[PDB]
Amino acid sequence: MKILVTGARGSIGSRVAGKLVERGLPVRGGVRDLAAPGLPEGVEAVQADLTRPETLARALEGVDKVFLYTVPEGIAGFVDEARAAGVRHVVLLSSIAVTWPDADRDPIGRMHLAVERPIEESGLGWTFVRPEALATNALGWAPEIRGGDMVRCAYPGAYTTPVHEEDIADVVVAALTTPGHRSAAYALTGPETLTQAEQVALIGEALGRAVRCERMPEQEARAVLEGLYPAEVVDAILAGQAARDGRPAEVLDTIRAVTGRPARTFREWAGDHVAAFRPA
């Protein structure tokens, strides 16, 4: 039976799809548009747009297992189609934000809870993968780092525990291909809690040049962030960073527990993505 990897041209989805193909498994790669490049080799491309759950009926034909991204507006329709198709297991890319005390008020927590809860109620087998900060969030600093030796952050001293996308993909693949993960919810962190300034410096080390981090005033940071996210999400981002300012975040050994391999370091991530931070 086939595995449908939704978002198979995405950072995580593409790596999930590639790793399943390396394992000889029949993989369908979900895309919004069949005509666009970037799908990994060996994947059967199918239209699977999670915002328009009617595309799933064809995409889910002969499918036993699904890798799902969080798209709350179509989850009811996904659940109905997965059930109709006889899907046995859904692995969801969620967020560690659902594990926090204020999850059901936090916009990010709420968004992910809005998909987890209906899956929990559906009768479908599931695994939730709940990462903390994505190491790929550092790619937002590329313009600054390509152009100079300084990055400006609202909270240079805020800690996160950034997690490499390959580790997320490895946990997903483990959950799709081995027993024992049914109703498991895996909170993933990288192997070290690091401040924003520390992360910026580690990118410097990958580049072979020193890169510095200076603080942006909150009014200016809020102005930049309100161009990128809804208001309530900007509030949650800054409130979250304030809470972690000079306060080391939790490091979990979940990646090693699931895969048998220690989590990839942010230093390794920066080496892996070093070309993104060099000038053109």
Annotated binding residue at 50? yes
Tokens of 22: 């390396």
Annotated binding residue at 247? no
Annotated binding residue at 272? no
Annotated binding residue at 164? no
Cβ atoms 163, 132 nearer than 8 A: yes
Annotated binding residue at 177? no
Annotated binding residue at 259? no
Cβ atoms 267, 202 nearer than 8 A: yes
Annotated binding residue at 12? yes
Number of C-beta neighbours around residue 94 at 10 A: 26
Cβ atoms 61, 26 nearer than 8 A: no
Annotated binding residue at 32? yes
Annotated binding residue at 49? yes
Cβ atoms 190, 159 nearer than 8 A: no
Q: Report the binding-site residues for NADP(+).
A: 11-12, 32, 49-51, 69, 112, 134, 137
Q: Report the binding-site residues.
A: 11-12, 32, 49-51, 69, 112, 134, 137
